[PDB]
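> tool_call: predict_assembly(chains=two)
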Amino acid sequence: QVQLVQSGAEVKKPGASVKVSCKASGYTFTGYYMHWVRQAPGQGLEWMGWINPNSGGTNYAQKFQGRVTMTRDTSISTAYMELRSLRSDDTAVYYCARGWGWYFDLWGRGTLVTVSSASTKGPSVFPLAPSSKSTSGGTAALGCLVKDYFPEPVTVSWNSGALTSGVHTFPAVLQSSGLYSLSSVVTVPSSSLGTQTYICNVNHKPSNTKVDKKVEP
Amino acid sequence: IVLTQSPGTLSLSPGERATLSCRASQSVSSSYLAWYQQKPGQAPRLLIYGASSRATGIPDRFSGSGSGTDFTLTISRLEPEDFAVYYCQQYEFFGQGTKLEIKRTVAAPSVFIFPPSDEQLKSGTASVVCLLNNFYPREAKVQWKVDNALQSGNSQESVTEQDSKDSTYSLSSTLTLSKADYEKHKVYACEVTHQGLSSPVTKSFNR
């Protein structure tokens, strides 16, 4: 199988450096250039550079010259991208892509690199209680508020994944505090508020935080 | 340095024909234009190379065509899997991306408001949440009013991806205040506007 496997997500302070790895398999690693493309959350794709795995020769985008270094280790078919002097706007998913010429036909799954002065922190989970203010027709709305965590991502399930219909989990927002926040909501029949319990399950792996929060009227 | 794609957003129903445009840069040759698809949480996926040749495995409803600087990606019959973001590429230059969304009938939002929890108030902060549920199109406006005074700069909003079942959007707007500020005021309200609403909808509560 033809595959590119990248190293895990990183969390860095501004001014630090990160080295991402990209191991190829299923093809001759030295017969194709390897490119690095990054994508900031909610934004477009940005080409960084390429490396010729057979020569080590490189070519970097102008805005990365002197900060980035791409290398390879053919004995283990791995490509490396080191970005130094990290700044917050370097927060992005970094992809390695095989260069079938200038066509990127094989991609890695990406590596999230977060650059912020914030320290890893688990979320506070607060209920968004239902009431008359959250009732329309026979349909009520309830949710959980996952506030002040760093870095991305968090996952939210309801009743351990037994409740899926009507669920809306919003993309995280980066608050001016440097911490993230999101809410998860679900609409249910207003008659089941007295018979069916509702628990949101929040998991924030980066800080190994697991919180179950019962949401009551 | 960034290629131009049009439109920014294309709204169509499944089974319709989609045409996306990309204007290559004149400084560099255009014979090597490529198109990519990207779905949420996934790496981009090569669709078209050489301006008009399909990548392996790509269904034949995708086709490419191009002159010297104007290139087009055509999807003949949109399947529900085809709605995503599409990028063009020319050497080291990527396009700004075009989002292909499902077009449905206009649906006005259902507005709900949530006060802060007593738990959060114990810590010294108060978050008020205004929920706009299952609406279309994506454009909406939320205005916060505390004791009938317009707020600004203390709210952030988030929007879901298009719902896979009913193709609607949902929007969250969170007003953040300190406990002290929150307890100085009485009425908290969010006013919602949307092309499906004949008049603004207001939801409020009394601390």
